[model samples]
Structures are given as C-alpha cells and as structure tokens.
Target: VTSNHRASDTVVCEGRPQVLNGRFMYGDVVTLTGEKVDVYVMTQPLSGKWIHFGTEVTNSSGRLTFPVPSERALGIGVYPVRMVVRGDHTYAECCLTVVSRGTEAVVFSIDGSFTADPKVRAGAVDVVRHWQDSGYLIVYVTGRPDMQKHRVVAWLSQHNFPHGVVSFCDHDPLRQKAMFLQSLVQEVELNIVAGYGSPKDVAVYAALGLSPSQTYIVGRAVRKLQAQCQFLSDGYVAHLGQLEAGSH
Candidate 1:
C-alpha cells in the first residue's frame, strides 16, 4: 500500500489608543540611516494633499528626527506618514493614529503556545485591559492552522480577552502567510500596535511598510533582523505595560 503526505492548512485570524497627561499629544520619531530625505503627514482615507513637515540630511550614522506639529497635526483619526529619500531610491511609510482624550488600540497575537505560559497569559491580559480601559481597540492575529480555529477562539473567550476581530491564515496546502497578513490588515483597516512573532515576522511587517521603530518582534533581537523590526528585549506580556504607557 502507498500513502500520501500533505501539509496542514493554514489558519487565518484578524485582528486603539488612550489619552495622555493634560494634553492629547501623539507623535512618532523615526530614525533612518539614509541621506537626504523629506518627511510628510497625510490625512487618512488616503488622499494626495500631504503637508510637508521639513527635510534633513542624515549624518554619517544616517539618523534624523522629524516632529509632527500639534497645530496642523492629524485630528483624532488615522493618518499615513512617509519619507522620501533624495540621494537614494528609498522610501519608508507607516500609519499614524490620533485619538480623542483617552482612546487607544491594541493588537495581540493569540498562539496556543503563548497562552499556555502562565506569565505570558497574565501579561497579555494585563495589556489588553490596560488598553481596553483607555478605550482602545483590541485586535488578535494568529498563525495556527485553520483546523484549530475553534479551539483558539474558545481559548480567547475562556480567558476573557477584550473583544476584537481575529484573522487566521489560509487553509490551503500552499499557504501564503505574508499575503494573508497583508490582506487581513487591509480588510479590517487596522493600525498595528505591536506584533509578536519570530524573525520571519520582521520581514512580514517590513514588507507592509512598517518602520523598525513601530514594528516589534517577540524574541531576542537578531543582529541581521535588527534593521527590519524592533526586537522586544522583554517578553510580549512584560513589554505590554511599557508600550501602553509610552504610546499614550
């Protein structure tokens, strides 16, 4: 007798903000090792009119900082920020979100392995509540096989995670993980808060135009992967509080 072997189907899952001290100020400082560049902020729902902030030429280290004006800054909504490097054929872009007085969004990845760890589960829940209390959206994404969908969803519910959309990978044998993630982000129009995954995730987020500063990986910071995404030195759950505090 002859037997056939095949890979399991991929699972798909889908996937906020709070206020600050006295003022509701939100800004992202990006550092890039490049030459001449132009930074601008454009309103969301993506239109053509982009307000130029300023321009700077990076030094030997190729680092520069640009601030978003509080006056003409983005309102309480989502916006896209982009950088145009003059000397090189390089461009970087990311989504920016502005909330009212105390609204924020939080994105969480729910893999069974993570939930199995007590510390991780506690930390994740803590982060979820922190954002939920501040009125932020909670999004969950997972790479588990589609066959485990019921178990995963039940697990999240059992743990009482804040409500939000969940995205999973394709069930096909030839799973396109990267493309699935991109589609999920578009379908739900989510502003990624922080993502938890392996080195491969670094490439995934980078391809979506996320800057290293905004993109975060879950494990040790790999030298080669360092340039792609921000490596969370601490575990995901432990870093939750810090991200919420700093971002808000």
Candidate 2:
C-alpha cells in the first residue's frame, strides 16, 4: 500500500522574511543521511525553466537546511522546487510559497460536499465565510485530482463557498491531503488557526499539527476517537455559537 510521497527538502532564511525548512524522507520511507541532493527552482511560473538553485547533503537525521542567500531570495508567489538524490537519481518535488509574515490562515477540507446534506453543507459555507470575514486567508486542501478542477470550482461556487486557495493532488488521499496542508504551513508561514473536515480527516488535520480543539469534524463521533477531535455532533448550526466565542 506504499505510494510515492514527496520529500520536503531544504530550508532557507537569510536572517528573517519567511523560511521553508524541509526533511528528506524518500518515497519508500528510506532515509538519505549524507546523501547529496541537487536543488532546482523554476525561474518563472510559466517559463518551464528549472534552474539549479544549489546542492547540499542530508545531515545525520536526514535533514537538509541551508539559507537561500539574500541575493537569491524569492518574491511573493508559489514557486516549484525539486531535489534530486544523487545516488539513485531519484528526486522529490516541492514548492515555496512566499507570503507576508504573520499571515493567518484557516484550512477547509471539502469532503463534506459529498456526504453531508445540503443543510450541513450550507453551514460549511457559512463557517468558511466567517473565517474569511475575520481577515484570515482561506485554504481548501482536497484529495481530488487536477482533472476535476473545474467541477470542484463549480460546486464551490454553487454552494457559495468563499474563494480560496484550493489544493488538489493526484495520489493517496491521506498523504496528499496531509502533505499539501503541511506544505502550506511550512512554505508560506501560515498561522493555521483552525481546520474543518469530517471523521476521516482526523489524521489529515493532525498531520498539520492541529490540536483536537482547533479541528472541527462534522459527523458522528466514534467511541474513544471523540477525544482525538472536536466533533460537531449537532452539526455546524449548533456549533456556530462556540466557534464565535472562540474567535473573539
């Protein structure tokens, strides 16, 4: 059941403005201690030119940390990056999204769209709107593929969900969702105040370092699992008051 997951490799900070630190764990869960990795960054979003950025070897704990010199600091935008393992020629793909410091964000998983009823789904929309109105950046990380981008956008529009940065990946749902959200937190320095999802998303949210209190799960609570996440047992409508109280 093992699948390829990108290794987050590299950390750059020339003394302040947003830094991205990553670990080099391979697709098969192998460590790359002392292994040389070549880093490359896309010159421009649409240029398709992946210029070599720099190279470094992983530390004893398979960690790679190096500052992107001030002369090469990236501007505001999501830039794709790749790291090639020298020995086997294998590589991992990652990105750096530069945003203003202290930018707070809230992540929403759209799985509720398929299983929850319209009433609950509409509540989901309202919840998202409240977060947006609070000046927090909205982020939607889903397991859907790029092929369904249009369909997903249309569904979101029909539901009147606030416009956000929707992340889609074509791989195992759990890993893709977790990694995507993790990337947002690491690359962009997003202060994730909260996350919304269903029962199945417990691990996904946990992987993002979200506390059970900060995680709002929409569905029935399973035995001991209740302690792991804050279940919206009575649906979002009943939970609105609590959410409002917490916001202030």
Candidate 3:
C-alpha cells in the first residue's frame, strides 16, 4: 500500500479523489472502453479494507476520470482502488498517491545514481531513503520508457530503495529530466534541494538552477564535470556519513 510500486497515480493536491486512471485496460480494448465501473478507496494498504466511493462510466474511447471527492479523499498517502463492472469477474486494480502541495525535493536518476553492478550501489538505497526519512520528498526521473516503469520499480523494490515520485518516459535523459523538473517548479512550486546522478546528469540539474554544490555525482566521470558536481566516488556511504554528522 504505502510501499514502492509504480502502479499508483501521482499524488493529487487538495484531497481530490486522486482519479484512478485516465487510461485503464479492459481486455482487448486496451482502455476501459465504454463501461461503468464501481470505485473504492483504500486509504492505507495495510488496513485491507476498501471504502466504497461509488461508480463512474467510461466514455466511448474508454477514458474516464473520477475524483474521490475532496471531503472523502482525505490526506497525503498512497491509496489503492478496486474497480469492477458487472460481476467481480473482470476487475482492475489501481492505486494513487496524495502528496504535499509544495516541498523541498531531492532528485535522483535511477540508473545513474541509484544503482551499480547492475544492482543497487553500496549504501545508495539507504542514502535516498534517509532523505525521505528526513522529510524531503524524493523524485526519481529516468529516461527509461513508460513500459519499463514496472521493471524499474520492481528493481528498486528488490534492492529496497526509498520510494518516491517516479517519472518514467522515453526520450533523451537530459531533456526528460529537465522538462519534468521545470514543470514541477513552474506549476507545483517545487524547490529542489539536491540532485544525485552520474556526471552526465550534472547539466540536467544545473540547468534547473541547482548549484554545483548541491549536485552529487556518484562515479569516476565526475572529474569530467568536476565543476558541476561533488563526486560520490567514495559512494553513498561516505556521503551519508557526512550528512548524518552535519545534521547535528
């Protein structure tokens, strides 16, 4: 429920129903495709009970968006959905996150900064989660395709990385990261406090107005962008030690 899964919708502001999905699959239709489905909200995953929120009928194109109603939507947290039409035979599972309106965030590039050895880097998982533990939202932006979202998320879960808002889209890594971060700043008033990635992503952070001191690169390539980032060559362990000591 509250764990890391790319299956949930982005956190909606102001206690909205968090709208299950704009495009939901229904067999060969690929989209809900003209169907009326009942919706339920589960405020927490561990609670194991879904509160009924009524129903919504999808349009001819199979797209329907319904809100949880601000009154019942409640606060910031991840919630799953139970959507069913007709009998319980053909049903779809969904989840969404309700997020804080604005907050300081630490950005990370999944492949470049979060993993090593085709696995998670040493101390990398702890480093990212610690920020969330310290109250800063974690935003993972990757150029991996939307289709790869599940695999990437599964990877994070497999290695136990801290869960955060994940942006999965295919294109140039730099452009995608820049556009998403820019959008958040312009629309959501997001304040980026730091960024973690390979040297290649240094410009992506700097272009967003983040300073060199705030960008932490995680490998040998940092020297190439030495002026752009603080190398995490010693890896997350050393970086975290500094962070912990400085916290006092």
Candidate 4:
C-alpha cells in the first residue's frame, strides 16, 4: 500500500552505511519524533524479496540511529535499503555501499568527460561492473554540487552502475577534485589504479600521482596531452577488450 499524503510532508536525511561501522543513521524533519522506523534490505539485487533487518524510534529531536546486528550484517557490495515509518509508511530510498580498506579502485569523473548518452552510459555500466566483479572498488568523483548527490545517485541507479564511493565538490572545482581524491587515499586507504574522465581531469589525476598510462580520457586525443593521458579513440568496447587482454 502507498503511504498517506501526509507522509510525503516529512523530510528525511539518510546516511551512507558501511559494514565496518555497523551503524544505521537517519533523521526526520517536520517533527516526526517518536515515529517507528523499520529497516529492510533486498536479499539480492533485482530480486523482489526484502528482509526485515531491525527497527528504531525517532528521538525527541527526530534523530534515529541503531547498530546493525552481526547476524544481519552485509558485506562489500551495493544493496537496496529502505527505512519506513510504521505509522504512515513514509520512507527514504537508500543504497548501501561497503568499501574495504586498502582496496584498489578505479576513478571516473562524471561531467564533461562522461557522456549522458544512453548507449555510452550502458558501456560505462558494463565497464564499471566488470571492475567491480574483479573485486576492485569503483570511485565516482564529480565537480557537481553536493545538492545533486541524490539526483546523481538516482541516475547511476537508473543506469544500473555498480555501487561504489561517489564524491561531489561544490566550490573551486579543480582543486576540490584533487583534494577529495587525496582524502580517499589518506582516509579510506584506497589505492587508485586507474582514472577516466575528460582532458581537464588529466591534471586532477596527475595531481593524485596517477601516471599517464593510468589516466584514460573519453574524448578525442588532444595534441598537447599525447603523452599525458590515453584517449578512448576506438570506444569502450575496444577499450574493454584491451583492458581484458592485458593490464589497465
């Protein structure tokens, strides 16, 4: 059944849960204090079954947080999660991604370098999924404002992109991009092996100490960047083939 119209009036702020932390966090505005929140997760992606994980109640300030039981914990991967209010069925759409420390990652910058075309996007979906299946974490870094976090995530979900860490920058796009990536290395201890984006991102990846061979540009090869980054001249299909034949 659908939630009542009033349920839509409530505002929910959700957190990105990780297996290492085991904490599920969220808060509701519009004075949703004392609301019963039931948490659930899909047993498998594309399958209809959802398993009830646990429950929590909003405090006087409408904040709610609870530890996920060890038995119900999930490992590294993407899973659909939902926190519904038992009283009104008001809920927030959640996507859970768990990244292990010291894992190798491939970075993709979404914007000028990445196309919005569905066909190209499908190839991106395939490429990222392949990397994920290879047990590598996929990292998406964008200069877009953080306000588009949910919208961009929705787009990735709609396109069936494999789950990974996504970073958004609001001010001073270029430097912020590099800084954010540096944080990934220092904080998450992620070793970024490859990067994909436009020519502008060449410097950003370079700043992160990624070699030219490790940097992949989407558009036509630039004359000046001949030795700085590799271009996707033949397209993702040929590139994926090349990637499979040898090291990236």
Candidate 5:
C-alpha cells in the first residue's frame, strides 16, 4: 500500500462481517493504522441517545476488535460506532454502521479527471490490472458521455487499464446519465466498490443500494454525503492503493 506522510498521521478503519443484519451476532473487527491510537465504540440508539459502549487499543496489525453485546444489551435498533485514533497533534475518525441484513452490489467509480493526472492514470490502470489478475470480471464505468468515449478509451488503452467491458453515458438530452449507469449495473449484475465525483455522485451510487463504506468518493469531502459514502481524503492515487491493499 502507498503511504502518505500525512496519512501516517491518519488512521484507517474497515469493519469485517462486511454483511450484517439487525443484530451483529458475530464479533466485528476494525483495523486502525497510526501511532499512539485509542479506539472506542460509541453507539447512537435509534431513539437518539448516544452511549459509550467501550474502548480498546489497536494491536500491531492496527486492529481493534469488539463484539456487539446481545440484542438485550444494545436493544433492537440501529447504532453508529467510530474509532478515534490520537497521535501527537493528529486525530482521525473512522465511521462504521450496524444495520439490518441486506445485500448490496460493489461498484467502483473512476474520476474522468484522472485522465489529466499521470499519477492517477497509472494508479487507475494498476487498480484495474489487480482486479483482473484476481479473477474479477472488470466493469469500467464512467460518468463522461459517449461523445468523450474515444478520448476515454484511448487513455485507457494507452495506459493499458485492464481489458474489461466499458460503459459510458449517452449524450441524448432525454436520458439521465446517472440513471443510465444504474441500469447498466443492474443489467450486468456487477458489485460496486468505489465512485469518484462530487456530492451528486453520492446520490447516484446510493440509489443503486450502495452504502458509504462501499462507495468511494473522490475530490473534496462532502459533509452531507460523508455518512453515505467513503471519501478519498487523500486523493485518487491513494484510494487506488487502498483498494489494492484491501484497505477500502
């Protein structure tokens, strides 16, 4: 995984049991990266009461393991837990969710702007390569219109971004591009991993039943959409590295 000097101060948290239901019967493990970190579990009940469940230190693997007590302990409802890691003048929060059971597709979004950044282009190419090498049927989706298809494909071809089926939006005024992308995902039966764009992209991905954890947003962080999708705080290249390392 590529590490940023600034990221060294930042901590990352990813929850296991990627799929869950009303009650988390299995223990949930959260991975935290950074130095001198303290992790805690804060539960926000459906009734709006916030309670501190517990705290634990992260191991060498930078993981904090915690279990959801019985339903009677937490009661039947929804809860939000976060990991707060502190290290000399730096602190970061990793958000998590406890929701009812449901399956959501994992879709990955690539920023059209990446074509302008050589580093980002290389990262994108590498990500698709890794996915293809891992036996994943690559599905490249972009928000750019069909008019720009040649430029996009040329860039992908020049950089050798894996050989996968590519999908783009129609230029027709009557067709909603985002919705068009959604229809394509359904027709293809692909899972979404990350999406890159502004706040509007968040809504597009959410409409397809992809949660924040599975949806990665690039560029500036939209506070309103932060809870609904994961933001690539560091940028496109870093986000790509995170995926390759299985951190996102």
Candidate 6:
C-alpha cells in the first residue's frame, strides 16, 4: 500500500502585501514554501464551497511563488485556507479573515489579560462580545509560538467566545505586539479603538498611540503606570458594566 500521509502543511507570512502584511491576497504574489512536493492549492469560501486559489511550482528552497487574484471573488469573513498534497488526503490549513479598510478593532493579550484574575476571569468573554456586538473586529494577539495555536484556539472555542482573529508570533512579547499593531494602523489602515493587556504591555499599547483611557490593564493600578492605563483590579465583571455604559 502507498503511504499518503507524508505531506505537511504550513501557513507562511508574505510581507510585501503590506495591506495585509500577513495574509494572501488577490492580484499579489504569494508563496508556498515547505519541504514537501506537489502541493495542490484549495480554498473554502463563506458558502462552504471548495475551489482552487491558484498555482505555483516549488523552488529548490521548497517554495512555490505565484500571484493571487486582484479582486475578491467571495464575501468577507474568516475562511479556511488549505493546501493539499496532490493525489492524496493529507493537507494543512489556516484562517484568513477578510475585512474592509478602516475597520475598527480591539486588541487582546491572551496570557497577560485573559487569565490575569482568579481561576478564570469573569465577564471577559462578555466584555469582548460587547465590542463585537458594537461592530468592532476582535484581535487577540500573543507572542506565543505558532505551534501552540491549536491548544490556544481550542480553549477559546471551548469557552464559546465570539469569532475573531488570534495571532501568534515569536519574539519579545511586548515589542513584537507594538510592531505588529503599528503595521495594522499604518499599513492595513485598521482603527484600533482600545486595547487590553497586563502592566508589561503598557508601553506596547501606548506605542499604538492609544490614550490612557483606552489602555485597559487587568490588574491592580500601579502608582507609576496608573496614569498611563486604567487598572482592572476590580475584575472584568465591573469593567464590563462600565464599558456598556460608556460605549452606549
């Protein structure tokens, strides 16, 4: 019997598409690089239909460089981006959340703010949901390796949180956040309405040019940092109530 499970899949970032800076796009050159051979590109649109994205041949570096369509062929939403090994069932996948320019977003620090409280954080999901309900894109960013994406996303899914983008990067958590968020503002043209993080991320949030009122920290207010970020020592429960009133 022939073995069919030998192909591996990966999601690589293409920076030249600065509008996305981290996503595949239409009419732009995107590359698929890996140690495997004969990859077949596929896509699943919002209607749950699968189709070809495009094609490219791999180089000695195990990379296939090619161009994607310039205009969107499908409606905006998160969709599965899959690459399969030809003549087999093995494949890999990632998510691409299509959004319009000038879309507003709220940033979240998974480890720092999401679990800053007791055994679990109260009203955290509801707080994130509030912004989602109000038409803001939810952006959960962390410096954790992409390898941990499965577990982290599983936790979020299990908790029944609203759908959003969860970005995982590898670097100094604080600095990496600032740089990535800056790209979202300067390049992608995303409007960051607010941000949530631990004290260590005060600078990260501030670097995004967010005001102290917009910088929400999930711990007791520090004397020095209190002036820079609102402390959430009382927990998300109380904070949720405040956001409801202010945002309304």
lDDT of 1 at 238: 63
Clash total of candidate 5: 13
Clashes of each: 21, 0, 2, 0, 13, 5
Residue 192 in model 5: lDDT: 49
TM-score versus the correct structure, for each prediction: 0.48, 0.59, 0.76, 0.64, 0.47, 0.76
Residue-level lDDT of model 4, residues 1-248, one tens digit each, is 33311111011112223321111123312455677778777758579788888888766755456556766666665677767778776665455655566768888997744564333443677777788888787778888764455567767777778767666664589899899788777765678899989889999999999999999988678899999999987777778888788766
Better of 1 and 4 by TM-score: 4
On the 0 to 100 scale, the lDDT of residue 112 in model 1 is 29
Task: Report the number of the highest-lDDT candidate.
Answer: 3
Better of 1 and 3 by lDDT: 3
Query: How well is each residue in 1-248 modelled by candidate 3, as lDDT tens digits?
Result: 11111233454554333556543453322544567777777776789988888777777655556766767766766677666654333555555656666767889988888766286788988888889899887888887865455567778779877767777664476887898888776665677889888877888998899888898888764345768778876778888998898732
**C-alpha lDDT values of all predictions:** 0.51, 0.68, 0.70, 0.67, 0.46, 0.64
Q: Give each prediction's root-mean-square deviation over alpha carbons.
A: 18.6, 8.7, 4.7, 7.1, 19.1, 6.9
lDDT string for model 5 (31-139, tens) is: 3343443333345534444454444444555544544344424322233443334433233222233222222223345454344334454365665566567655455
Write model 2 residue lDDT over 82-168, tens digit each, in one string.
777777776666566555665788888877532462333536777788888988877877776543555566677777888676676
- Give lDDT tens digits, candidate 1, residues 178-239: 56555545643545554545565566556655677766556667887757776656765667
- Output the worst ten-in-a-row residue range by lDDT, candidate 4: 4-13
Candidate 5 segments exceeding 4 Å error:
1-113, 116-122, 171-175, 193-198
Looking at model 3, residue 144 earns an lDDT score of 82
